[PDB]
């Protein structure tokens with residue numbers, strides 16, 4: 001299952 | 010130009 | 019970073035992101051938060067991106083080490099090194115939680131800022147829960163749940179169902195239900211309802227907002243495909 | 247890492263590589279070197295892999311920052327942050343060079359170990375040269391050249407032309423000639439002669455050695471394709 005990647009502005 | 014990647018044992 | 023100007027810290031955080039120097043990015047953004055002013059939308063995203071990258075690398079390393087350790091359980095070095103990485107991960111989570119507690123959440127009055135920070139609070143308690151055992155696991159799980167629930171309550175009252183932060187909050191809370199709380203049915207129900215209510219609101223959006231919302235909806239659908 | 251056993255440091259370096267924790271890997275291998283015993287073939291590779299990954303990330307960040315800085319030259323923050331990354335990169339190179347000088351090279355009597363360490367010495371002086379300016383650039387360039395040349399002289403006397411370390415040394419020295427020393431013709435000649443002499447020796451190799459040698463030969467050919 002994936003959460004928000006959230007690693008790029 | 011590439012040198013030896015050298016980043017994996 | 020007390021001697022550096024706030025604006026210089028923000029500028030350097032943006033440079034560190036371009037250079038893929040996420041530890042530096044996080045340190046610059048911690049310094050910016052500690053100047054004591056509220057953060058703009060863009061600055062909140064820089065803070066979040068920085069720490070998500072730092073803790074994401076730690077979590078991936080912890081999972082590799084925990085897998086090796088479990089296989090060896092089928093000298094002390096694997097456990098010792100997993101413990102070292104785990105302590106560093108917990109320290110980063112504690113640092114982010116401390117920024118949120120001193121004083122980002124209490125100064126956040128608009129729904130957009132308050133939801134964003136409460137979602138972060140849920141996420142960093144969830145990362146603590148991933149490595150916790152036993153009874154401290156219980157209290158950490160409840161802290162994550164409570165943060166996400168407060169964020170959900172505000173988001174449902176104050177934001178449209180397509181708002182990307184509302185969508186990402188629901189996505190991450192659904193992951194919490196599935197992976198942490200042992201509530202796969204709650205995870206599936208939340209993802210389904212979120213997806214459906216967003217779909218019904220897409221007609222209100224511009225082309226650019228539509229792209230933002232549908233990108234996160236696809237993540238909800240990807241989880242539903244895996245879970246059902 | 248003075249209180250940790252040598253064998254535990256090596257074991258943890260291998261775990262850190264699997265976890266993609268290259269800074270930890272390098273610290274474990276530095277501790278292992280500082281125990282004062284010579285390194286085995288496998289341990290030399292762990293040391294090299296660790297530092298190549300650390301300095302590789304720094305070099306990539308420095309190039310991003312230097313590009314932004316040059317575009318701005320067509321406040322002080324870009325230069326300050328490039329300088330910060332540059333200083334950290336120079337510190338890592340100095341650390342590796344200091345391990346080689348105290349005392350890995352002087353204790354290396356077999357050709358395989360001595361060539362490996364002198365190739366490392368050339369490489370870390372080359373990384374210093376990439377960020378150096380002016381006259382200190384000259385002396386750093388000469389230190390790289392001298393290390394590579396000594397390694398080449400030993401390798402040509404003591405190793406077959408297909409030996410992977412001899413091949414990688416020649417590849418990296420050719421890159422030095424092309425990118426650092428402003429000697430593209432010397433770079434092309436060295437890569438061509440190295441490739442041709444290796445090709446003529448492939449018939450002597452087992453299937454596994456053939457794969458090892460041909461992989462590096464392909465890198466020489468890839469550079470020749472770009473340079474000619």
Ligand SMILES: *Cc1ccc(S(=O)(=O)N2CCC(O)CC2)cc1
Nearest residue numbers: 004006063137182183186187230
């Ligand atoms: C939790 C979360 C993080 C990031 C996003 S986003 O990538 O859609 N984006 C929303 C608009 C803002 O600029 C912040 C980043 C959604 C949810």
Ligand SMILES: *Cc1ccc(S(=O)(=O)N2CCC(O)CC2)cc1
Nearest residue numbers: 013015291365410411414415458
């Ligand atoms: C400089 C250099 C590094 C690595 C290699 S390698 O990947 O072919 N390999 C050679 C055999 C040893 O096990 C060391 C690693 C070649 C050159």
Ligand SMILES: [Ca+2]
Nearest residue numbers: 022023024025
């Ligand atoms: Ca100021």
Ligand SMILES: [Ca+2]
Nearest residue numbers: 250251252253
């Ligand atoms: Ca001992």
Ligand SMILES: [Cl-]
Nearest residue numbers: 098099102258
């Ligand atoms: Cl450890």
Ligand SMILES: [Cl-]
Nearest residue numbers: 056125126127
């Ligand atoms: Cl406020």
Ligand SMILES: [Cl-]
Nearest residue numbers: 030326327330
């Ligand atoms: Cl700086």
Ligand SMILES: [Cl-]
Nearest residue numbers: 284353354355
């Ligand atoms: Cl010796």
